[PDB]
Subunit: 177 residues, 4 copies
């Protein structure tokens, strides 16, 4: 499809393996993962299991780009971590588009005085203002992840995703309350 | 001896629970993900049902007579809200019990629980679950922890992992 | 009918508790301040005893059959630590009980409690306190909340406050 | 004293009244107070009671300037707040010296996209890089607050503070364990 990239779970595992493999090549084994909620949740958990990283923390930050709510920049809603001083930190997200979210998170994490902050995203857009330190693939269309496919379907009746009928039947019932 | 759900099955597990919540007419205001096994289930359930508020509790259970230990609770007020606690497996049931007990202290309008899978000997049954299973469940999100314990478990992509793990052993720490 | 401690008395209350902790040989690893009445006592106690780790719990009790309601818990791991929960007054004792109960879920090595003042009818007695008092205590940190309730309470600087409060009523909201 | 300012509790109350009075003059009634832990704790609580402000949140941030630990800039250890979007926020600290702490906190709070962020400190030093939006007095010596007087005494056997003998007897016992 020209307008969407719809990766399978197998591609997501390949993406996470690739990040892990790159981390080991660079000898950057993080002390702490910072998952960018909520798109970075699954990537961070999978990477954590892959590399036996026992410490995951979280930042709730969102780039509002919808009909109901539109903003110019990412907005932090909360930061879920204690001291990161002297730690090697890796920020993990599912995709860097403009790169503003990773920049915002990097900036705020740097205020915790870690030993090092680096960034990882599964996917990168050509127009991103900064290349993440670690990434799996550059792609120039909108990515539909397995964990936000139904949000896309809700906003877009056209898109072809697996299990759509089962979802529509459920969504239908939700809409009637 | 082992149950190793595909991502396809995990999706069906989440669909199952989402359908039960809808059929039973319980639509959560807030999901509490039990870290870290519950975070992928919670995320998938949030997407399916369009639940915009996910909060988290860092809790651990060192099985061998232990009790669950809370390390942190990441949430603000839950008062007056319908909460669904979400975890990946209910084995002893201690974790869900502990989480429900602390969430109740936030005076929500209701707390219910959900886990993808349930063990026969669980002291408490989740309000919502996909399947009860006798075998040891290897999740897509903890398959390498299991392999690092026993290398001979029959999971896919094990060679790619062992390749990586080998290098990892040399550079850490 | 009223007890209105000076800052001098508050200091002596904190000294009293600090001396009791030292005499009794319990030196906390972590203070849990019960927000918001406990935060000034906790800060003063932290300075006296050189306690560098203060954490917090946002909890409220709407007296008229209610229960304390937790709004958030601000702490990471307490496991293996000696904790002292700190509040300004123990009236019904429900708040301290609730806080102790949730902190125990973090598996600390010990939780003890402290409040500056104690009411005769408290269901639970703080492990450390300064004085039991029958009167309604007006703290230096909630004197204006009391005045806003009843203007005729005998606190100092009330005219400066009413002057300010009057302007405040006009511009809010 | 040329080297220390040691305010009484009555002066602290005067300071908090003055901030409150200035807030009302400016018609800036905050929705949320951000207390800068731990020096801003007492000022924020007193201001909260004074102006009936029911929402107080917290940031744990420290400027290490001691023998045991020295740093160039403030370091955030944790941020205790949920969404501040669209709120009028007032950052409250006990003193602005270099002004780096208030700057750091203002910067991070601005990432939460509040309607407005302003700052208040009881005291201001002449060499501060920015004047807080609200303050009680400018002073050019080290302030010993009622809530960190014993920390000063521990680091400095000379300073004259009330109740020192009672403290030394206690400190003595602490040191022997
Ligand atoms: N599903 C999906 N989410 C995206 C896409 N691009 C950006 N996002 C979301 O927006 C953030 C990145 O936006 P940025 O700040 O890089 O513009 C990420 O945290 C990600 O969750 C996309 O193509 N597909
Ligand atoms: N991957 C996996 N972990 C399990 C399984 N059964 C129990 N556990 C772990 O063992 C504990 C069981 O106690 P409970 O989860 O009921 O508190 C939890 O820490 C849980 O993560 C299982 O079948 N598969
Ligand atoms: N200022 C003040 N507040 C009190 C006094 N007694 C009770 N309260 C308030 O009433 C409640 C008493 O219940 P408890 O504190 O034991 O949970 C708390 O919310 C406490 O702050 C008092 O004597 N003075
Ligand atoms: N006790 C005391 N603390 C100070 C003094 N100056 C700065 N501080 C502490 O350091 C911070 C301000 O430092 P700045 O970032 O403005 O250099 C405040 O949060 C305050 O707690 C002082 O003169 N006396
Ligand atoms: Mg995102
Ligand atoms: Mg998104
Ligand atoms: Mg778990
Ligand atoms: Mg209280
Ligand atoms: Mg300070
Ligand atoms: Mg200081």
């Amino acid at each position: 499809m020209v307008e969407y990239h719809i990766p399978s779970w197998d591609e997501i595992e390949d993406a996470v393996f690739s990040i892990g493999e790159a981390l080991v090549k660079s000898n950057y084994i993080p002390d702490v993962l910072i998952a960018v909620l909520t798109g970075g949740i699954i990537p961070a958990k999978l990477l954590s299991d892959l590399l036996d990283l026992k410490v995951i923390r979280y930042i709730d930050i969102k780039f509002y780009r919808s009909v109901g709510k539109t903003e110019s920049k990412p907005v932090i809603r909360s930061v879920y971590t204690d001291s990161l001083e002297g730690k090697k930190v890796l920020v993990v997200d599912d995709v860097a588009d403009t790169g503003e979210t990773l920049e915002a998170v990097s900036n705020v994490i740097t205020m915790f005085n870690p030993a090092k902050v680096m960034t990882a995203a599964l996917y990168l857009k050509p127009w991103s203002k900064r290349i993440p330190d670690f990434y799996y693939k550059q792609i120039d269309k909108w990515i539909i992840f397995p964990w936000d496919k139904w949000d896309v379907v809700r906003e877009n009746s056209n898109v072809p995703v697996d299990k759509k009928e089962r979802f529509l039947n459920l969504y239908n019932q939700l809409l009637k309350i």
